[PDB]
């Protein structure tokens, strides 16, 4: 789980958290305005030391139409089942230690991505 910013309703600014001492609940107040709203996530901050980020979430379907990207026929797609497919490393800095590929289907209207 993570936590996202929730803007105010009137002034549209950052809402800081607040622990209601009276009703013993979690609130989000506004620095300028006096808006209040009852919380639901019961979380404020989370830190990922390992930074276990799913590279698949960053990959896009447009990578398929790349003329300087390798293609293989031995790793067909799952949904559509097309043969042609591309493969490449994380291509992201701060790679811990892994050259694990991220296969992406090479066909319109699919944009599927998987890993083996």
Partner 1 sequence: HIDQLKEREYNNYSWQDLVASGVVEYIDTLEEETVMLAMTPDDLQEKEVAYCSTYTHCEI
Contact 82, 71 (CB under 8 A): no
| DSSP calls for 67-95 | TTS-EESSS--SSS--S-EE------SS-
Annotated binding residue at 43?
no
Residue 33 touches Zn ion, criterion: CB under 5 A = yes
Contact 2, 46 (CB under 8 A): yes
Map residues 39-78 to x or -, x wherever contact with Zn ion holds by CB under 5 A: --------------------------------------x-
Q: Which is nearer to Zn ion, 70 or 92 (CB)?
A: 70
Q: Which does 67 bind (CB under 5 to 8 A by kind): partner 1, Zn ion, none?
A: partner 1
Enumerate binding residues for partner 1 (CB under 8 A).
67-68, 70-71, 73
Per the structure block, which two tokens stand in for 43?
Answer: 């979380």
Q: What are phi and psi of 40, to 5 degrees?
A: -135, -20
Which residue(s) pair with 40 in the sheet?
none
When binding is defined by CB under 5 A, the residue of 26, 27, 63, 110 that contacts Zn ion is: 110
Per the structure block, which two tokens stand in for 87?
Answer: 């493969």
Residue 80 touches Zn ion, criterion: CB under 5 A = yes
Please state the residue numbers annotated as binding site: 8, 11, 30, 33, 77, 80, 105, 110
Sequence ranges of the binding site for Zn(2+): 8, 11, 30, 33, 77, 80, 105, 110
């Amino acid at each position: 789980g993570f936590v996202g910013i929730r803007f105010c309703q009137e002034c549209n600014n950052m809402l800081y958290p607040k622990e209601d001492k009276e009703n013993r609940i979690l609130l989000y107040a506004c620095r300028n305005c006096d808006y209040q709203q009852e919380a639901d996530n019961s979380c404020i901050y989370v830190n990922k030391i390992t930074h276990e980020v799913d590279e698949l979430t960053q990959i896009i379907a447009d990578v398929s139409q790349d003329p300087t990207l390798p293609r293989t026929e031995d790793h067909p797609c799952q949904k559509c089942g097309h043969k042609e497919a591309v493969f490449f490393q994380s291509h992201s800095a701060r790679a811990e230690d892994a050259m694990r590929l991220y296969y992406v289907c090479t066909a319109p209207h699919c944009g599927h991505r998987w890993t083996e």
